[PDB]
Amino acid sequence: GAMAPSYRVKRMDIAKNDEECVVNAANPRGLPGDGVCKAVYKKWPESFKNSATPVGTAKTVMCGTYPVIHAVGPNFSNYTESEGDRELAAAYREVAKEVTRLGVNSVAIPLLSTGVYSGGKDRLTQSLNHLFTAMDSTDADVVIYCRDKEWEKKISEAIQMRT
């Protein structure tokens, strides 16, 4: 574990992370996709061998010895708000299990279901709170990656609020 487990946020490409493993915002079919998923495919394409997994689950595939945790958040275009919320919470609980199993001291993680899977809604707070619920009991350093300057500020404030 980390000596003093922390949360941090960076505004940059998760494919350039400085952590011991990465969470992919995957699709259920293990396709290259777009956004975070396409950047992950370009950086770690070997990790997409048998990466297909259902909504609400996480499946780890090694690229060399570097773990890529494929986490499948719901597409809120397809799910009801209620069912989507349940699957989004579940995807993050499965990430916590994988991070624990791997024994890493740090993990790079995007906010699941906040991009093309958001169903055109702002889900920063919803997605981040489910990330916290899952990861709070783990002792890995968590580094959240985002692309928007306003999101960086909001995520940083939410981290600092808990102290």
Task: Give the binding site for Cl ion (CB under 5 A).
Answer: 12-13, 115, 117, 146-148, 151
H or E element: which one contains 8? strand 7-11
On whether 145 is known to bind a ligand per the annotation, the reply is no
**Residue 35, marked binder:** yes
**CB nearer to Cl ion: pick between 44 and 151:** 151
Q: Whose Cβ is closer to Cl ion: residue 2's or residue 12's? A: 12
Residue nearest to Cl ion as judged by C-beta position: 115
Is 62 or 93 the residue whose CB approaches Cl ion more closely?
A: 93
* Beta-strand pair 141-146/58-63: unpaired
Asked if residue 27 belongs to a known ligand binding site, the reply is: yes
Structure tokens at 145: 């990656």
| Strand segments (E) across 55-136 | 58-63, 66-71, 106-110
Residue 78 annotated as binding site: no
CB of 10 to Cl ion, least distance (A): 9
| Min separation Cβ 56 and Cl ion, Å | 14
CA–CA dist 63, 139 (Å, integer): 23
**Cβ atoms < 10 Å from Cβ of 143:** 19
Q: CB of 153: closest distance to Cl ion in angstroms? A: 11
DSSP state of 23: E
* Annotated binding-site positions: 13, 27, 35, 115-117
